[PDB]
C-alpha cells in the first residue's frame, strides 16, 4: 500500500489542481493602461529523495533508521516538484473577448514542498536494498 501510494498517488494528487491562474483585468482608468494580464502557476512531475535530515546549523545528510530512533528524528524524505510560471497579456478593447498571448516570459526549477515520512523496508527506504550483512552493519535486525 505504501509503495503504491508513493509511486502513483502522489503524482495523481498533484495532477488535480496543478494549475492556478490569476487574471488581472484591464482596470480601465486611462487609455495608456488597457492591457490585461494573466499569471499561471502549474505543477509538473514530482521527485522524492532518500531519507535525509537537516541539522540546526543547516547541514543536511542521509538519515538511517537507527540514528533516527536514537536522536528522536523523523524518518522522512523531501518532496520536490517542477513548477512552470507563465504570464499572458492581451489588449482589452472594450466590448470584445480577449486573446491571451504569451509575453515571452515562461520561467521554469525544483521547489521543496515538505517532507514525506517513509515506511521502513519500502522502496524509498535504505534497508530495502540491504542484505543480511548490510543490516548487521547498519545495526538493524534481519
Amino acid at each position: 500500500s505504501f509503495n503504491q501510494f508513493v509511486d502513483y498517488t502522489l503524482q495523481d494528487i498533484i495532477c488535480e489542481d496543478s494549475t492556478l491562474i490569476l487574471e488581472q483585468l484591464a482596470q480601465h482608468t486611462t487609455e495608456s493602461d488597457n492591457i490585461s494580464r494573466k499569471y499561471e502557476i502549474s505543477f509538473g512531475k514530482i521527485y522524492v529523495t532518500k531519507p535525509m535530515v537537516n541539522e540546526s546549523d543547516g547541514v543536511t545528510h542521509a538519515l538511517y533508521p537507527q540514528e533516527a530512533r536514537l536522536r528522536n528524528l523523523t524518518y522522512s524524505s523531501g518532496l520536490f516538484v517542477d513548477v512552470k510560471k507563465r504570464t499572458y497579456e492581451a489588449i482589452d478593447v472594450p466590448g470584445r473577448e480577449l486573446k491571451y498571448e504569451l509575453i515571452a516570459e515562461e520561467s521554469e526549477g525544483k521547489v521543496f514542498i515538505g517532507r514525506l515520512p517513509i515506511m521502513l523496508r519500502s522502496k524509498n527506504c535504505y534497508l530495502s536494498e540491504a542484505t543480511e550483512s548490510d543490516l548487521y552493519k547498519l545495526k538493524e535486525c534481519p
Partner: peptide
Amino acid sequence: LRRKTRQLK
C-alpha cells in the same frame, strides 16, 4: 468595479 484579482478555474 471588479475586485481586480480573481481566480479562474
